Amino acid sequence: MRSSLAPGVWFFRAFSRDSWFRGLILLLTFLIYACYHMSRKPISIVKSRLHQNCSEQIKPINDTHSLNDTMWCSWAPFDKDNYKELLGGVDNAFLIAYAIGMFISGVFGERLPLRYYLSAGMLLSGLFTSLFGLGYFWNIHELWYFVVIQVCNGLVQTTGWPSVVTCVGNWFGKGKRGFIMGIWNSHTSVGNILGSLIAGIWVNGQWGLSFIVPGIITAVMGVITFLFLIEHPEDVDCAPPQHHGCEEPAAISFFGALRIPGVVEFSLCLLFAKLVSYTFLYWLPLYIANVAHFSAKEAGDLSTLFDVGGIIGGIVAGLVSDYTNGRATTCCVMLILAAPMMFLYNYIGQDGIASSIVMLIICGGLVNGPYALITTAVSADLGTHKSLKGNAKALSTVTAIIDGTGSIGAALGPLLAGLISPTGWNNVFYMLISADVLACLLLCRLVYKEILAWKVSLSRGSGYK
Template identity: 65%
Template sequence: MVLCSPQNPLQDGSLKPASRPLSPLPPSRTYDANIPGDFYYHLSRKPISIIKSQLHRNCSTLIRPPNLNGTDNETWCDWVPFDQDNYKTLFGAVDNSFLVAYAIGMFFSGIFGERVPLRYYLTIGMLLSGLFTCLLGLGFYLNIHSIWYYAFFQAMNGLVQTTGWPAVVACVGNWFGKGKRGFIMGVWNSHTSVGNILGSLIAGVFVSSDWGMSFIVPGIIIASTGVLCFFFLVESESDLLARILKASQTLVRTMLIVVYGQEDNEKEPLLQNSSSNEEIFSSPGQSNSISSEPAEEHTKAISFCGALRIPGVMEFSLCLLFAKLVSYTFLYWLPLYIANVAHFDPKEAGDMSTLFDVGGIVGGIVAGLVSDQTGGRASTCCVMLILAAPMVTPGPFIVSLRMLLVCGALVNGPYALITTAVSADLGTHESLRGNSRALSTVTAIIDGTGSIGAALGPLLAGLISPTGWNNVFFMLITADILACLLLSRLVYKEVRGWCGHSPRHRG
């Protein structure tokens, strides 16, 4: 049956077929995808940095309980094995067990993400992340003092948390086109900084009295969100349409049973994807395009090497390595630097360091908005990295409120843009010829390469800091410059496009 338009009668009195397809999902309307951001992943990975001050403390400033046995007055309040002089090395081992596992797992995560429904993938990842986070907290109640216990579950947590970023970027990319993708994803990406801030606040509530709950509460939160994700996440508009059709089938079949007392004898589904049903939502001239949709839906997922050959993937991946090196060095070492330079106590230094995350929220939004207006993703990143280099200099001025905000915006802006809008652009690049199953793999490659920098940055800072903070900042400036140089080819291409020498392409 063909739907007809009453406004176009033919000469014989019949009705002319509608010239426009009647779609149950108008393309001009954007539907809520109920996308769970990486917010909960960041919230659950933050407690480890908060409880460090509780695991190793200055016991001489505390009142020793009278019923406490032992003669060591210097470390009686510390948590074994972090009560020795090598506690910084042990903390570094715990941190790097997460970061290294995350970096390695990210390269494989995208491959699985392209082949497993994202709803199931995120659900499993969130449930396992909640489990491993809670197991870290159980170390307090079970009185576990083995460094291998904490390093192992941190590594396992790092592996399962790789399910988050490629999947959520793929979900967002499925719902928004390139036109305003930078701005939309810039706003959306602010959840990472908000997750860091909220994770710090939740962990801080319990850290002094019961630090095990600093892990267990975030673990329960992310696991509960995984359950909500399973029931309510809609991956794309096609997924929403499939659910509507399935619900319609169930409703019609139920009505038949109620009316006739038995299920319809037809073996074929009432709303199957047949040629007659295609005519309901399209005109005859568009039947070929609709019939090709199932073939596109089942396109073979792109390989790892195939994703690397997409123009721009290598450049942005290596650029993110150095950008993330700078960002994560600030994330792990900024509170200590503020405490040493400005002579703040640990709580004040931690609170002040959150301004860097606040600046990152603004920087991500600005970077996305500017890149949307100019069409130059690489140029936007390069300009912000150039401006960030003089800001990343040692001295008391960097601990001022304004400088922390500005530095956070310039450092985290390119990082946020590359991991969101750029990844989505490259995952839907024109060279893929319509293959929509590359977004998760491309995102994993880019963020996985960046995660190598995230692991190297804090490690190098720990090795260099004994020689002076100036050398640490010189390392960060060098990383910024290298990140800019890696984008030089893409920037040149974008500038030529603006000058009219060649067509301008994003990504």
């Protein structure tokens, strides 16, 4: 008898129509690239079952031949003395192929529709992931099966990142990108944790089923993204974005994307800033079990907080980057301050667990912050750059160049972390601080431009345009 509209459908009423289509994509691409990080994780959990030292795990009585020195419990290509080498090659053939084949998935992204391209990539990314664990049921014992599958999976997994940031760059304007994409980047941690939680169920058991369920969830999301993806904001005919400046512009040439004046320096900064976050997280279990002496459990517990620091730092850097209008001055002051604070972690970290939480969150903040900021905000900034003057379309080629040079660092991670490791386990810690000066020195020209632009903005005294 008294209508008085309900507070929920009065709150949901206030949002405009083309402010719902922005909320859909920013959710949908949150689930698409959280399923790419789910299918990469099951080879770093089942690393510890394909060798399986038989000190524990007592023997069911079937064979008593030659005492079975780590060949009873093990999988047959990975059973002898060379298992760190043979399991190194399998994990290395993915990292080489994903970094070489990323540059091609940029120039295929702008020449194909992003719903027929991002949804064939997910089906093949589920298939080649699931064949790895399907090799358990077929009882396959050969190196060149598990190598070739990881090669094809590394070539297929690269259709994901040039398409997702293109979809979330066609919608959102220049207004807030450090805050919204900083909030948004928690999918690369949600995916790692939900991969570590799913693939670890069927390990210590039927390990070939650790690969099939994350391969099937990706192929189901690859058909949900075929049905509900709108790549341009003019397809539903609501509103073009806040990008200032019938037919569609022709895509850029690959040599033209290196001409945009900030790509090949942010690129070489990201190559050297991914290597820091690799070799610190490599050096850390060498520091726990040799100096600190905490446990064997805490080494996998502190690596989670080193990532939680990253999703705090990615939004703090984004807020400062938006409200101050400098994107390479934030990435320099966030990388300068990590070297004295990692020396401080080296000097304080011998103490209890109360000092190993207030340091690792800050370390993940200062190290995984510029990675997120460079890989999304300045990557969707330089794609829609003003020098293209509207008569070009280069948004998937720049975000392929920057991330495919950032993946050369992850590919050169374990090739150098295994080289100087026999000469002393405290010798990678100099590679850390060398790369944290290289990554800072590759931004000095950008920082000089950002400071020089403030003199013609602040000395004018609230001037004209």
